[PDB]
Design a protein around this ligand. Structure first.
Ligand code: FNP
Length: 297
């Protein structure tokens, strides 16, 4: 039982050991491009780079580089794009990517400012009367509307390719109370938030991979994607307990490094998956319970 194993790990306080085993077994691929001197200012952190084999390439001719990774989950039938929280000089790239990948949604798991330090840049407009134009990638972005909740805000954005004048509605899901190296404020909050994204249709195969990011795009982003993939996994393979979260994470770390940055987020991943499992295997109310418990209102 998923529950039994979880309690065993907790009872023995093995979360740090398991998490540490994951780091040591994690894949390690080259990041030549990410480390090219010219791209130095395109990476928020020196030690966090997308693997070359899976990095998302901008279709631009100058520099196709952006600190983003395509996490393709074969069995789970779902791809995501994990990227760092855009930098002052990479906002055009970010949206360029969102455009070229035909993304429908963007999941932000961090705040533009955490403890006097900017964990990310204001890459989307805060006021509707002030659209944003990223001149380098010839993109226009406009806040159409937004639904502000207690711990998360969902925004409707219109992304326009100024070149072709083509337009697209991007759904911006912003979890606002997930601290760096911290965890969601309950499995309920998280799942409540994950299912909003799901019901939005942003994760649908009819759209490009959803863009998920935090600060470095590995900790919170990793946690969010791990949870979503495991729940996705234990629904298609009818035999949920066979889903080995630790291994799913390892599968994931093959496409981007450092997914899940703390033993606690790893534990949370298990909690969120176990909790969210109640949905996959019946119970059409736990979702109303998460919404209730998340106190989003
Ligand atoms: O999403 P989180 O909370 O996991 C994060 F973004 F806060 C986080 C994650 C990975 C990091 C790696 C390196 C640095 C660095 F400080 F070492 P560097 O020296 O490479 O800039 C900072 C990092 C911060």
């Amino acid at each position: 039982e998923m529950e039994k194993e979880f309690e065993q790990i907790d009872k023995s306080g093995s979360w740090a050991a398991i998490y540490q085993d994951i780091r040591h077994e994690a894949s390690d691929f080259p990041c030549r491009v990410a480390k090219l001197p010219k791209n130095k200012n395109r990476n928020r952190y020196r030690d966090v780079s997308p693997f070359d084999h899976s990095r998302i390439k901008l279709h631009q001719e100058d520099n196709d580089y952006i600190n983003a990774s395509l996490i393709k989950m074969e069995e789970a039938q779902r791809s995501y794009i994990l990227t760092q929280g855009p930098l002052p000089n990479t906002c055009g790239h970010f949206w360029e990517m969102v455009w070229e990948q035909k993304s429908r949604g963007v999941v932000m798991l961090n705040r533009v400012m955490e403890k006097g330090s900017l964990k990310c840049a204001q890459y989307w407009p805060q006021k509707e009367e002030k659209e944003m134009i990223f001149e380098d990638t010839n993109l226009k972005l406009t806040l159409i509307s937004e639904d502000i909740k207690s711990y998360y805000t969902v925004r409707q954005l219109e992304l326009e390719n100024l070149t072709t004048q083509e337009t697209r509605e991007i759904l911006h899901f912003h979890y606002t109370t997930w601290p760096d190296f911290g965890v969601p404020e309950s499995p309920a909050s998280f799942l409540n938030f994950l299912f909003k994204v799901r019901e939005s249709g942003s994760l649908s195969p009819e759209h490009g991979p959803v863009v998920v990011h935090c600060s470095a795009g590995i900790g919170r982003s990793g946690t969010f994607c791990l949870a979503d993939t495991c729940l996705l996994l234990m629904d298609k393979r009818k035999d949920p307990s066979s889903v080995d979260i630790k291994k799913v994470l390892l599968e994931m770390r093959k496409f981007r490094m450092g997914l899940i940055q703390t033993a606690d987020q790893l534990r949370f991943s298990y909690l969120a998956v176990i909790e969210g499992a109640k949905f996959i295997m019946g119970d059409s109310s736990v979702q109303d319970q998460w919404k209730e418990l998340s106190h989003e209102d």
